Amino acid sequence: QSMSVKGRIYSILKQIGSGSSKVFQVLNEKKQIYAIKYVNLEEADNQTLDSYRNEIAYLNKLQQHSDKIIRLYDYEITDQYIYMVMECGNIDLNSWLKKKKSIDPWERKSYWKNMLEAVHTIHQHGIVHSDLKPANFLIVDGMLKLIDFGIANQVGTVNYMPPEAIKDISPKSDVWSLGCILYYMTYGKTPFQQIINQISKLHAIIDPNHEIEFPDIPEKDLQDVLKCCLKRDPKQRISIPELLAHPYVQIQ
Ligand SMILES: c1cc2cnc3ccsc3c2cn1
């Protein structure tokens, strides 16, 4: 199969993702590899169109500010569709962590640093993603990159949801969600993964008398990061600038 984006032809190699949007692995005329995100605007309302346009403008602006944000090379927006030419990753973080038995402490730290940089950048532009999960990150050349910003309208998981989001959102909400991802990378499960029932799980996340277990590991700095991120009171939670100065990210 084939497709045109701003007068340039792309040969389709395979389908990567998919609701009213499909993501494909493609090749250009110069035989280079990209990802084309196709979005169908056929049954999209004005609020939806506006959320999609807002996300595209933020992605395109924030390109320049950090290499930990996915590259957007070009796009074609009409009334019926959106075509976005982006860089191709190797795998998303969720699929990678699910396949992998154990994570090496060096790659985890490297990945954590990238997650902090990408999220820091969005916060500096007034954006709180509000729905961070490992699916929002992409491995590209041993480098973790953020794929989206949470503006445009793993499906609806609550394992990474901060207590304040369950009650109701400041940058501290993204800190909780990032801590849950690092907790998965550390202990092999999210802090409340063991609770099947969604109601009982939402009740545990908000419950202060419900103690999050932090089993002893050889990395005390890593244990401290986790305890700092996973503080139920947003006022008592560590900030991104504070996490970037933490020993876990700096020592050695
Ligand atoms: C947008 C762009 C992507 C680029 N590359 C990859 C590679 C695996 S998922 C994915 C993407 C998913 N959404």
PDB file of C-alpha atoms and ligand atoms in Angstrom:
ATOM      1  CA  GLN A   1       0.000   0.000   0.000  1.00  0.00           C
ATOM      2  CA  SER A   2       0.900   3.750  -0.330  1.00  0.00           C
ATOM      3  CA  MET A   3      -0.061   7.331   0.847  1.00  0.00           C
ATOM      4  CA  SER A   4       0.684  11.037   0.218  1.00  0.00           C
ATOM      5  CA  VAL A   5       1.651  13.612   2.903  1.00  0.00           C
ATOM      6  CA  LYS A   6       2.301  17.231   1.673  1.00  0.00           C
ATOM      7  CA  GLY A   7       3.175  16.008  -1.858  1.00  0.00           C
ATOM      8  CA  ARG A   8       5.540  13.263  -0.595  1.00  0.00           C
ATOM      9  CA  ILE A   9       4.889   9.530  -1.167  1.00  0.00           C
ATOM     10  CA  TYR A  10       5.164   6.958   1.687  1.00  0.00           C
ATOM     11  CA  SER A  11       5.138   3.187   1.162  1.00  0.00           C
ATOM     12  CA  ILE A  12       3.423   1.354   4.080  1.00  0.00           C
ATOM     13  CA  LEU A  13       5.585  -1.393   5.762  1.00  0.00           C
ATOM     14  CA  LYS A  14       3.193  -2.370   8.605  1.00  0.00           C
ATOM     15  CA  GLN A  15       0.469  -1.169  10.989  1.00  0.00           C
ATOM     16  CA  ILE A  16       1.806  -0.239  14.448  1.00  0.00           C
ATOM     17  CA  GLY A  17      -1.227   1.044  16.445  1.00  0.00           C
ATOM     18  CA  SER A  18      -4.997   1.789  16.226  1.00  0.00           C
ATOM     19  CA  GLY A  19      -9.562   4.097  17.589  1.00  0.00           C
ATOM     20  CA  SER A  20     -10.531   6.453  14.677  1.00  0.00           C
ATOM     21  CA  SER A  21      -6.686   6.722  14.340  1.00  0.00           C
ATOM     22  CA  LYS A  22      -4.192   4.180  12.884  1.00  0.00           C
ATOM     23  CA  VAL A  23      -0.349   4.422  13.198  1.00  0.00           C
ATOM     24  CA  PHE A  24       1.829   2.863  10.455  1.00  0.00           C
ATOM     25  CA  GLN A  25       5.510   2.119   9.842  1.00  0.00           C
ATOM     26  CA  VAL A  26       6.292   3.732   6.454  1.00  0.00           C
ATOM     27  CA  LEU A  27       9.182   4.456   3.980  1.00  0.00           C
ATOM     28  CA  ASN A  28       9.706   7.743   2.099  1.00  0.00           C
ATOM     29  CA  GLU A  29      11.023   8.265  -1.516  1.00  0.00           C
ATOM     30  CA  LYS A  30      14.660   8.467  -0.084  1.00  0.00           C
ATOM     31  CA  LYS A  31      14.015   4.972   1.541  1.00  0.00           C
ATOM     32  CA  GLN A  32      13.981   6.408   5.165  1.00  0.00           C
ATOM     33  CA  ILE A  33      11.720   4.988   7.913  1.00  0.00           C
ATOM     34  CA  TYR A  34       8.955   6.996   9.731  1.00  0.00           C
ATOM     35  CA  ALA A  35       5.617   6.538  11.549  1.00  0.00           C
ATOM     36  CA  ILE A  36       2.508   8.044  10.031  1.00  0.00           C
ATOM     37  CA  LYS A  37      -0.375   8.683  12.363  1.00  0.00           C
ATOM     38  CA  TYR A  38      -3.610   8.759  10.361  1.00  0.00           C
ATOM     39  CA  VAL A  39      -6.700  10.266  12.221  1.00  0.00           C
ATOM     40  CA  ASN A  40     -10.253  10.164  10.753  1.00  0.00           C
ATOM     41  CA  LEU A  41     -12.130  13.474  11.344  1.00  0.00           C
ATOM     42  CA  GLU A  42     -15.438  12.176   9.800  1.00  0.00           C
ATOM     43  CA  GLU A  43     -17.404  11.878  13.118  1.00  0.00           C
ATOM     44  CA  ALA A  44     -15.252  14.414  15.122  1.00  0.00           C
ATOM     45  CA  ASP A  45     -16.984  17.402  16.804  1.00  0.00           C
ATOM     46  CA  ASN A  46     -15.540  20.946  17.285  1.00  0.00           C
ATOM     47  CA  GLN A  47     -14.295  20.238  20.863  1.00  0.00           C
ATOM     48  CA  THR A  48     -12.529  17.077  19.538  1.00  0.00           C
ATOM     49  CA  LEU A  49     -11.033  18.952  16.512  1.00  0.00           C
ATOM     50  CA  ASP A  50      -9.880  21.681  18.803  1.00  0.00           C
ATOM     51  CA  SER A  51      -8.235  19.224  21.250  1.00  0.00           C
ATOM     52  CA  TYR A  52      -6.438  17.524  18.247  1.00  0.00           C
ATOM     53  CA  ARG A  53      -5.223  20.908  16.861  1.00  0.00           C
ATOM     54  CA  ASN A  54      -4.044  21.980  20.313  1.00  0.00           C
ATOM     55  CA  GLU A  55      -2.039  18.773  20.830  1.00  0.00           C
ATOM     56  CA  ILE A  56      -0.441  19.094  17.298  1.00  0.00           C
ATOM     57  CA  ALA A  57       0.633  22.735  17.986  1.00  0.00           C
ATOM     58  CA  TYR A  58       2.121  21.760  21.382  1.00  0.00           C
ATOM     59  CA  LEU A  59       3.997  18.763  19.860  1.00  0.00           C
ATOM     60  CA  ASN A  60       5.326  20.906  17.027  1.00  0.00           C
ATOM     61  CA  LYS A  61       6.405  23.769  19.461  1.00  0.00           C
ATOM     62  CA  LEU A  62       7.978  21.487  22.123  1.00  0.00           C
ATOM     63  CA  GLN A  63      10.079  19.723  19.393  1.00  0.00           C
ATOM     64  CA  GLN A  64      12.758  22.453  19.660  1.00  0.00           C
ATOM     65  CA  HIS A  65      12.919  22.283  23.526  1.00  0.00           C
ATOM     66  CA  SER A  66      13.719  18.581  24.085  1.00  0.00           C
ATOM     67  CA  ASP A  67      14.966  15.539  22.221  1.00  0.00           C
ATOM     68  CA  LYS A  68      12.927  13.424  24.784  1.00  0.00           C
ATOM     69  CA  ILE A  69       9.714  14.493  22.934  1.00  0.00           C
ATOM     70  CA  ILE A  70       8.843  12.456  19.719  1.00  0.00           C
ATOM     71  CA  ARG A  71       9.882  14.172  16.418  1.00  0.00           C
ATOM     72  CA  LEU A  72       7.013  15.536  14.254  1.00  0.00           C
ATOM     73  CA  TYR A  73       8.541  15.998  10.760  1.00  0.00           C
ATOM     74  CA  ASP A  74       5.471  17.190   8.852  1.00  0.00           C
ATOM     75  CA  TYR A  75       1.655  16.916   8.862  1.00  0.00           C
ATOM     76  CA  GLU A  76      -1.382  17.249   6.570  1.00  0.00           C
ATOM     77  CA  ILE A  77      -4.651  18.472   8.198  1.00  0.00           C
ATOM     78  CA  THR A  78      -7.881  18.671   6.168  1.00  0.00           C
ATOM     79  CA  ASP A  79     -11.584  18.495   7.193  1.00  0.00           C
ATOM     80  CA  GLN A  80     -11.742  14.670   6.674  1.00  0.00           C
ATOM     81  CA  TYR A  81      -8.276  13.628   8.000  1.00  0.00           C
ATOM     82  CA  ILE A  82      -4.963  14.254   9.783  1.00  0.00           C
ATOM     83  CA  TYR A  83      -1.621  12.676   8.562  1.00  0.00           C
ATOM     84  CA  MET A  84       1.344  13.191  10.898  1.00  0.00           C
ATOM     85  CA  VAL A  85       4.891  12.174   9.816  1.00  0.00           C
ATOM     86  CA  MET A  86       6.850  11.348  12.941  1.00  0.00           C
ATOM     87  CA  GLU A  87       9.947   9.408  13.932  1.00  0.00           C
ATOM     88  CA  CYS A  88       9.641   5.642  14.342  1.00  0.00           C
ATOM     89  CA  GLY A  89      10.431   4.030  17.690  1.00  0.00           C
ATOM     90  CA  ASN A  90      11.501   0.440  18.309  1.00  0.00           C
ATOM     91  CA  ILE A  91       8.782  -0.386  20.910  1.00  0.00           C
ATOM     92  CA  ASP A  92       6.572   1.417  23.465  1.00  0.00           C
ATOM     93  CA  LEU A  93       7.631   1.150  27.136  1.00  0.00           C
ATOM     94  CA  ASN A  94       4.514  -0.898  28.169  1.00  0.00           C
ATOM     95  CA  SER A  95       5.075  -3.653  25.523  1.00  0.00           C
ATOM     96  CA  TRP A  96       8.788  -3.683  26.325  1.00  0.00           C
ATOM     97  CA  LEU A  97       8.356  -4.033  30.139  1.00  0.00           C
ATOM     98  CA  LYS A  98       5.651  -6.763  29.658  1.00  0.00           C
ATOM     99  CA  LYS A  99       8.010  -8.846  27.373  1.00  0.00           C
ATOM    100  CA  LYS A 100      11.155  -8.283  29.560  1.00  0.00           C
ATOM    101  CA  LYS A 101      11.673 -10.531  32.634  1.00  0.00           C
ATOM    102  CA  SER A 102      13.961  -8.172  34.647  1.00  0.00           C
ATOM    103  CA  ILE A 103      15.148  -4.554  34.059  1.00  0.00           C
ATOM    104  CA  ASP A 104      18.874  -3.701  34.447  1.00  0.00           C
ATOM    105  CA  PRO A 105      19.446  -0.897  37.065  1.00  0.00           C
ATOM    106  CA  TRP A 106      21.466   1.203  34.593  1.00  0.00           C
ATOM    107  CA  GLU A 107      18.811   1.171  31.816  1.00  0.00           C
ATOM    108  CA  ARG A 108      16.060   1.906  34.395  1.00  0.00           C
ATOM    109  CA  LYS A 109      17.994   4.986  35.706  1.00  0.00           C
ATOM    110  CA  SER A 110      18.703   6.071  32.075  1.00  0.00           C
ATOM    111  CA  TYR A 111      14.918   5.661  31.312  1.00  0.00           C
ATOM    112  CA  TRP A 112      13.911   7.509  34.508  1.00  0.00           C
ATOM    113  CA  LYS A 113      16.147  10.508  33.550  1.00  0.00           C
ATOM    114  CA  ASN A 114      14.467  10.664  30.070  1.00  0.00           C
ATOM    115  CA  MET A 115      10.970  10.450  31.620  1.00  0.00           C
ATOM    116  CA  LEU A 116      11.855  13.381  33.981  1.00  0.00           C
ATOM    117  CA  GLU A 117      13.306  15.500  31.083  1.00  0.00           C
ATOM    118  CA  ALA A 118      10.215  14.944  28.761  1.00  0.00           C
ATOM    119  CA  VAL A 119       7.700  15.658  31.560  1.00  0.00           C
ATOM    120  CA  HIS A 120       9.754  18.653  32.890  1.00  0.00           C
ATOM    121  CA  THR A 121       9.631  20.211  29.344  1.00  0.00           C
ATOM    122  CA  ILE A 122       5.790  19.938  29.124  1.00  0.00           C
ATOM    123  CA  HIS A 123       5.364  21.450  32.642  1.00  0.00           C
ATOM    124  CA  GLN A 124       7.600  24.413  31.611  1.00  0.00           C
ATOM    125  CA  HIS A 125       4.978  25.149  28.848  1.00  0.00           C
ATOM    126  CA  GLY A 126       1.969  24.933  31.172  1.00  0.00           C
ATOM    127  CA  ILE A 127       1.060  21.344  30.355  1.00  0.00           C
ATOM    128  CA  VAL A 128       0.203  18.584  32.808  1.00  0.00           C
ATOM    129  CA  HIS A 129      -0.302  15.298  30.988  1.00  0.00           C
ATOM    130  CA  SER A 130      -2.631  13.965  33.667  1.00  0.00           C
ATOM    131  CA  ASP A 131      -2.613  10.450  32.224  1.00  0.00           C
ATOM    132  CA  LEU A 132       0.911   9.036  32.319  1.00  0.00           C
ATOM    133  CA  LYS A 133       1.296   5.286  31.758  1.00  0.00           C
ATOM    134  CA  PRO A 134       4.268   3.363  30.219  1.00  0.00           C
ATOM    135  CA  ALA A 135       2.237   3.322  26.890  1.00  0.00           C
ATOM    136  CA  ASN A 136       2.862   7.151  26.549  1.00  0.00           C
ATOM    137  CA  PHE A 137       6.652   6.511  26.176  1.00  0.00           C
ATOM    138  CA  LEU A 138       8.608   5.111  23.245  1.00  0.00           C
ATOM    139  CA  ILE A 139      12.063   3.510  23.039  1.00  0.00           C
ATOM    140  CA  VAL A 140      14.046   5.062  20.172  1.00  0.00           C
ATOM    141  CA  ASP A 141      17.795   4.235  20.053  1.00  0.00           C
ATOM    142  CA  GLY A 142      18.055   3.316  23.773  1.00  0.00           C
ATOM    143  CA  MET A 143      16.350   6.639  24.484  1.00  0.00           C
ATOM    144  CA  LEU A 144      12.921   7.001  25.990  1.00  0.00           C
ATOM    145  CA  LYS A 145      10.635   9.583  24.292  1.00  0.00           C
ATOM    146  CA  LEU A 146       7.178  10.986  25.292  1.00  0.00           C
ATOM    147  CA  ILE A 147       4.589  10.362  22.541  1.00  0.00           C
ATOM    148  CA  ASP A 148       1.666  12.586  23.600  1.00  0.00           C
ATOM    149  CA  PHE A 149       0.724  15.439  25.974  1.00  0.00           C
ATOM    150  CA  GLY A 150      -2.723  14.371  27.241  1.00  0.00           C
ATOM    151  CA  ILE A 151      -4.590  17.222  25.421  1.00  0.00           C
ATOM    152  CA  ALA A 152      -6.190  15.246  22.486  1.00  0.00           C
ATOM    153  CA  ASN A 153      -9.554  13.434  23.148  1.00  0.00           C
ATOM    154  CA  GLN A 154      -3.364   0.912  27.655  1.00  0.00           C
ATOM    155  CA  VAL A 155      -7.080   1.865  27.693  1.00  0.00           C
ATOM    156  CA  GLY A 156      -8.295   3.683  30.832  1.00  0.00           C
ATOM    157  CA  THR A 157      -6.064   1.993  33.489  1.00  0.00           C
ATOM    158  CA  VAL A 158      -6.273   3.377  37.105  1.00  0.00           C
ATOM    159  CA  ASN A 159      -2.921   1.885  38.351  1.00  0.00           C
ATOM    160  CA  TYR A 160      -1.060   5.203  37.616  1.00  0.00           C
ATOM    161  CA  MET A 161      -3.884   7.536  38.816  1.00  0.00           C
ATOM    162  CA  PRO A 162      -2.944  10.013  41.604  1.00  0.00           C
ATOM    163  CA  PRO A 163      -5.221  10.227  44.728  1.00  0.00           C
ATOM    164  CA  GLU A 164      -6.212  13.874  43.896  1.00  0.00           C
ATOM    165  CA  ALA A 165      -7.487  12.775  40.387  1.00  0.00           C
ATOM    166  CA  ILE A 166      -9.738  10.094  41.998  1.00  0.00           C
ATOM    167  CA  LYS A 167     -11.172  12.726  44.455  1.00  0.00           C
ATOM    168  CA  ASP A 168     -11.857  15.436  41.738  1.00  0.00           C
ATOM    169  CA  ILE A 169      -4.417  18.257  39.043  1.00  0.00           C
ATOM    170  CA  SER A 170      -1.099  20.165  39.292  1.00  0.00           C
ATOM    171  CA  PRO A 171       2.370  19.043  37.925  1.00  0.00           C
ATOM    172  CA  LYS A 172       2.530  16.839  41.116  1.00  0.00           C
ATOM    173  CA  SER A 173      -0.110  14.554  39.498  1.00  0.00           C
ATOM    174  CA  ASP A 174       2.408  13.582  36.789  1.00  0.00           C
ATOM    175  CA  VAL A 175       4.988  12.950  39.604  1.00  0.00           C
ATOM    176  CA  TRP A 176       2.643  10.304  41.150  1.00  0.00           C
ATOM    177  CA  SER A 177       2.122   8.624  37.715  1.00  0.00           C
ATOM    178  CA  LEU A 178       5.901   8.659  36.973  1.00  0.00           C
ATOM    179  CA  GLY A 179       6.532   7.125  40.450  1.00  0.00           C
ATOM    180  CA  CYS A 180       4.076   4.283  39.611  1.00  0.00           C
ATOM    181  CA  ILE A 181       6.072   3.604  36.325  1.00  0.00           C
ATOM    182  CA  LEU A 182       9.390   3.581  38.261  1.00  0.00           C
ATOM    183  CA  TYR A 183       7.745   1.328  40.921  1.00  0.00           C
ATOM    184  CA  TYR A 184       6.751  -1.141  38.082  1.00  0.00           C
ATOM    185  CA  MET A 185      10.384  -0.950  36.714  1.00  0.00           C
ATOM    186  CA  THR A 186      11.667  -1.653  40.290  1.00  0.00           C
ATOM    187  CA  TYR A 187       9.272  -4.244  41.854  1.00  0.00           C
ATOM    188  CA  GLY A 188       7.745  -5.747  38.657  1.00  0.00           C
ATOM    189  CA  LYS A 189       4.169  -4.522  39.453  1.00  0.00           C
ATOM    190  CA  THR A 190       2.344  -1.159  40.056  1.00  0.00           C
ATOM    191  CA  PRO A 191       1.745  -0.226  43.799  1.00  0.00           C
ATOM    192  CA  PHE A 192      -1.943  -1.400  43.737  1.00  0.00           C
ATOM    193  CA  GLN A 193      -1.731  -4.047  40.885  1.00  0.00           C
ATOM    194  CA  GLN A 194      -2.683  -6.884  43.333  1.00  0.00           C
ATOM    195  CA  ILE A 195      -6.222  -5.398  43.766  1.00  0.00           C
ATOM    196  CA  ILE A 196      -8.511  -6.824  40.998  1.00  0.00           C
ATOM    197  CA  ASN A 197     -11.760  -4.913  41.913  1.00  0.00           C
ATOM    198  CA  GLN A 198     -11.540  -1.319  40.515  1.00  0.00           C
ATOM    199  CA  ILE A 199     -13.730   0.133  43.331  1.00  0.00           C
ATOM    200  CA  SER A 200     -11.571  -1.445  46.121  1.00  0.00           C
ATOM    201  CA  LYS A 201      -8.410  -0.304  44.213  1.00  0.00           C
ATOM    202  CA  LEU A 202      -9.616   3.372  43.953  1.00  0.00           C
ATOM    203  CA  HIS A 203     -10.416   3.142  47.680  1.00  0.00           C
ATOM    204  CA  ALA A 204      -6.855   1.893  48.460  1.00  0.00           C
ATOM    205  CA  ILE A 205      -5.070   4.699  46.463  1.00  0.00           C
ATOM    206  CA  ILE A 206      -6.906   7.426  48.400  1.00  0.00           C
ATOM    207  CA  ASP A 207      -6.679   5.561  51.788  1.00  0.00           C
ATOM    208  CA  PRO A 208      -3.869   7.076  53.976  1.00  0.00           C
ATOM    209  CA  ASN A 209      -4.047   4.105  56.405  1.00  0.00           C
ATOM    210  CA  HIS A 210      -3.303   1.860  53.344  1.00  0.00           C
ATOM    211  CA  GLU A 211       0.485   1.475  53.451  1.00  0.00           C
ATOM    212  CA  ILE A 212       2.332   1.151  50.110  1.00  0.00           C
ATOM    213  CA  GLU A 213       4.985  -1.571  50.630  1.00  0.00           C
ATOM    214  CA  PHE A 214       8.508  -0.543  49.595  1.00  0.00           C
ATOM    215  CA  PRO A 215      10.559  -3.822  49.827  1.00  0.00           C
ATOM    216  CA  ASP A 216      14.279  -3.349  50.578  1.00  0.00           C
ATOM    217  CA  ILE A 217      16.460  -3.318  47.441  1.00  0.00           C
ATOM    218  CA  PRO A 218      20.286  -2.689  47.096  1.00  0.00           C
ATOM    219  CA  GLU A 219      19.492   0.809  45.721  1.00  0.00           C
ATOM    220  CA  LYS A 220      18.496   2.959  48.730  1.00  0.00           C
ATOM    221  CA  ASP A 221      18.448   6.125  46.457  1.00  0.00           C
ATOM    222  CA  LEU A 222      15.892   4.341  44.185  1.00  0.00           C
ATOM    223  CA  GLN A 223      13.807   3.401  47.266  1.00  0.00           C
ATOM    224  CA  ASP A 224      13.837   7.042  48.448  1.00  0.00           C
ATOM    225  CA  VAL A 225      12.665   8.343  44.979  1.00  0.00           C
ATOM    226  CA  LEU A 226       9.703   5.889  45.122  1.00  0.00           C
ATOM    227  CA  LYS A 227       8.697   6.907  48.663  1.00  0.00           C
ATOM    228  CA  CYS A 228       8.954  10.639  47.588  1.00  0.00           C
ATOM    229  CA  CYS A 229       6.813  10.245  44.416  1.00  0.00           C
ATOM    230  CA  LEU A 230       4.211   8.061  46.102  1.00  0.00           C
ATOM    231  CA  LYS A 231       3.141  10.598  48.791  1.00  0.00           C
ATOM    232  CA  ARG A 232      -0.706  10.827  48.772  1.00  0.00           C
ATOM    233  CA  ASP A 233      -0.658  14.592  49.702  1.00  0.00           C
ATOM    234  CA  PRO A 234       0.430  16.573  46.604  1.00  0.00           C
ATOM    235  CA  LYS A 235       1.834  19.258  48.972  1.00  0.00           C
ATOM    236  CA  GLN A 236       4.145  16.546  50.523  1.00  0.00           C
ATOM    237  CA  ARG A 237       5.164  15.154  47.089  1.00  0.00           C
ATOM    238  CA  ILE A 238       8.551  15.875  45.460  1.00  0.00           C
ATOM    239  CA  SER A 239       8.562  18.147  42.359  1.00  0.00           C
ATOM    240  CA  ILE A 240      10.210  17.432  38.949  1.00  0.00           C
ATOM    241  CA  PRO A 241      13.037  20.066  39.534  1.00  0.00           C
ATOM    242  CA  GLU A 242      13.687  18.335  42.915  1.00  0.00           C
ATOM    243  CA  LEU A 243      13.700  14.863  41.307  1.00  0.00           C
ATOM    244  CA  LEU A 244      16.311  16.100  38.739  1.00  0.00           C
ATOM    245  CA  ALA A 245      18.689  17.054  41.642  1.00  0.00           C
ATOM    246  CA  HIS A 246      18.056  13.750  43.565  1.00  0.00           C
ATOM    247  CA  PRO A 247      21.062  11.364  44.194  1.00  0.00           C
ATOM    248  CA  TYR A 248      19.337   8.561  42.181  1.00  0.00           C
ATOM    249  CA  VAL A 249      19.627  10.686  39.002  1.00  0.00           C
ATOM    250  CA  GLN A 250      23.004  12.328  39.886  1.00  0.00           C
ATOM    251  CA  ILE A 251      25.307  10.013  41.822  1.00  0.00           C
ATOM    252  CA  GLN A 252      27.967   8.033  39.945  1.00  0.00           C
TER     253      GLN A 252
HETATM  254  C1  LIG B   1       2.922   7.370  17.346  1.00  0.00           C
HETATM  255  C2  LIG B   1       4.175   7.263  16.826  1.00  0.00           C
HETATM  256  C3  LIG B   1       4.897   6.063  17.013  1.00  0.00           C
HETATM  257  C4  LIG B   1       6.182   5.850  16.466  1.00  0.00           C
HETATM  258  N1  LIG B   1       6.864   4.731  16.566  1.00  0.00           N
HETATM  259  C5  LIG B   1       6.293   3.715  17.263  1.00  0.00           C
HETATM  260  C6  LIG B   1       6.919   2.422  17.499  1.00  0.00           C
HETATM  261  C7  LIG B   1       6.166   1.615  18.276  1.00  0.00           C
HETATM  262  S1  LIG B   1       4.671   2.321  18.772  1.00  0.00           S
HETATM  263  C8  LIG B   1       5.020   3.780  17.905  1.00  0.00           C
HETATM  264  C9  LIG B   1       4.292   5.001  17.753  1.00  0.00           C
HETATM  265  C10 LIG B   1       2.991   5.271  18.240  1.00  0.00           C
HETATM  266  N2  LIG B   1       2.318   6.404  18.047  1.00  0.00           N
END
